[PDB]
Amino acid sequence: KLEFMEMEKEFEQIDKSGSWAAIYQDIRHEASDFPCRVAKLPKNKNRNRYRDVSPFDHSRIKLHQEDNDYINASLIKMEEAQRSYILTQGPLPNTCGHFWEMVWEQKSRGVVMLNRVMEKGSLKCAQYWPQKEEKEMIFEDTNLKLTLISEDIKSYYTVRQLELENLTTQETREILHFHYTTWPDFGVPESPASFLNFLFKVRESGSLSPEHGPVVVHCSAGIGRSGTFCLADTCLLLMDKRKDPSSVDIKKVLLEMRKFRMGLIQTADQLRFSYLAVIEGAKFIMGDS
Length: 289
Ligand SMILES: O=P(O)(O)C(F)(F)c1ccc(CC(Cc2ccc(C(F)(F)P(=O)(O)O)cc2)(c2ccccc2)n2nnc3ccccc32)cc1
Fold this sequence. Notes:
Elements: H1 2-16, H2 20-28, E1 60-62, E2 70-78, E3 83-88, H3 96-105, E4 110-113, E5 137-139, E6 144-153, E7 157-166, E8 171-180, H4 192-204, E9 215-218, H5 225-241, H6 250-258, H7 268-285
Parallel strand pairs: 3-9, 4-8, 4-9
Antiparallel strand pairs: 1-2, 2-3, 5-6, 6-7, 7-8
Helix pairs in contact: 1-7, 2-6, 2-7, 4-7, 5-6, 5-7
This protein binds the ligand O=P(O)(O)C(F)(F)c1ccc(CC(Cc2ccc(C(F)(F)P(=O)(O)O)cc2)(c2ccccc2)n2nnc3ccccc32)cc1.
């Protein structure tokens, strides 16, 4: 498979020449820009975790509710890869109900969390799901109830089964929560293997299938590690769908993705890691004969 050796040789070359930073800065400065007027309305200020991270008006997710339909969340639809994702911020203490409301309305089956719950700090996230099976939580504003059904804690991530119920209709659905616990803000996962294993667990669960609503992906701001996660998944899908893997251009795919939500992939190391996981990941998908 000389085609992979090439990419690897290229990757090695970029590593040698120390040009990941330059490649990344080139990509980000060609990023598109769109309005975020709704995110900037005075009434939505307390719904945004970060002043400068906002969903574009054209791709933001709307809550089918009365008062305010706003949530800092964006729909990323990748046409060629045949995959959609909803990227959002780690829930605020006042937006946890909106968060589950969105999961319901969009019929999402899975939630991928890539950050850690933080009570203090400028990079945090509220405890939006039950820590204890016996202590379920009710979101009064959106009339929803959620219960932890199961939990399987592993080394790099935790998989949970939750049960969400619309109190207005007594209906209930099973939501899978995949929490990668060792991914620091502005950092990279423990390792490619670790990341790929987590990603494969999410895939095999069916949470990403078109049958359900888009998987909801978030970290703290919903752009750096969420951006890295989605880019890798997307490129993997493309290398398998396309006749030749080497034809996948990380820059072009990242730019396409950035049309839907700003700042996806926050550091050059995240970009490099992204391509490293795609190289290794794609090798796996085509070699277990
Ligand atoms: O994995 P993630 O997504 O959770 C992350 F860790 F990468 C992340 C954490 C925090 C921020 C908001 C930030 C910094 C910031 C602001 C705007 C952007 C952007 F997308 F708009 P850009 O196009 O410029 O690349 C990017 C980064 C922050 C950094 C450090 C500490 C706290 C918050 N932020 N948001 N608003 C800010 C106002 C002042 C300073 C920093 C701000 C952004 C990303």
